[PDB]
Amino acid sequence: ATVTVTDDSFQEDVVSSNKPVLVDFWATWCGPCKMVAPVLEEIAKDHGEALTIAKLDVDANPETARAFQVTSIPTLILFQNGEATKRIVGAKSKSALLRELDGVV
Amino acid sequence: DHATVTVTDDSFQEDVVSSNKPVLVDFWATWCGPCKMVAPVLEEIAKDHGEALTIAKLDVDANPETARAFQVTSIPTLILFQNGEATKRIVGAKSKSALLRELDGVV
Ligand code: NA
């Protein structure tokens, strides 16, 4: 359910997205990134009609990491109509992320 | 004694944990902008103080075992080691004056 976005695809996949997109800016070795990943997938499976969930590997896509000044990981950014509207830092439980996504799901 | 050094997952135990000099490790990444700001600051501190303090750089994505070991979730993170004990954790880019103040008593 989760989609992979890159520096090349970001504009089409996220900024030009008809529906809201939550982007997980993550890195490979980071504990909280490993933990939040399946939580996001379970959210994407449950709320797929309302919300797209995307992953952006910061090490592989440094242009987009830098554009949103990602300096803590994971950083989750909600995009609505081309604009970043929520920024959530750290692993979060399913319930905590659903709090942050209230009115979007 | 006058310049920064590189440390790795393979070299960390010998270079940092077993060092008799204090060591300041810069946990940095290619994808993180503020790391570019702090790098020359660290070099300037090494020039002035390298006989007393080793300044080491650890690229977190190349060295995932050490990055995870110190639970570095913000970049850059600078960790001071004294006798292998992590005694201070400094988060984010800092000015030369600011970093020198963080290193009070060390340099
Ligand atoms: Na890298």
- Sequence-distant (6+) residues with CB within 8 A of B38 are B26, B28, B76, B78, B93, B94, B99
B36: contact with A, CB 8 A cutoff: no
Structure tokens at B26: 């810069």
By C-alpha distance, the chain A residue nearest B74 is A72
Contact (CB, 8 A) for B84 and B53: no
* Method used to determine the 3D structure: X-ray
In angstroms and rounded to an integer, the radius of gyration of the C-alpha atoms of chain A is 12
Q: Tell me the chain A residues in contact with residue B29 when contact means C-beta distances shorter than 8 Å.
A: 27, 58-59
Structure tokens at A76: 């989750």
| Integer Cα distance of A50 and A66 in angstroms | 28
**Listed resolution, Å:** 1.7
A105: contact with B, CB 8 A cutoff: no
B41: contact with A, CB 8 A cutoff: no
Task: Determine the 3-state secondary structure of B56 from DSSP.
Answer: strand
Domains in chain A, start-ordered, CATH in brackets? Answer: 1-105 (3.40.30.10)
Contact (CB, 8 A) for A38 and A32: no
A63: contact with B, CB 8 A cutoff: no
Q: Ligand 1: distance of its center to the CA of B31 in Å?
A: 6
Q: Ligand 1: distance of its center to the CA of B105 in Å?
A: 33
Neighbours of B7 (CB within 10 A): 23
Structure tokens at A87: 């920024």
DSSP one-letter code for B4? -
A69·B29 Cβ contact <8 A: no
B34·A71 Cβ contact <8 A: yes
Structure tokens at A81: 């109509």
Active site residues of B: 32, 35
Helices and strands, number each (H, E), in chain B: 4, 5
Q: Is A30 a catalytic residue?
A: yes
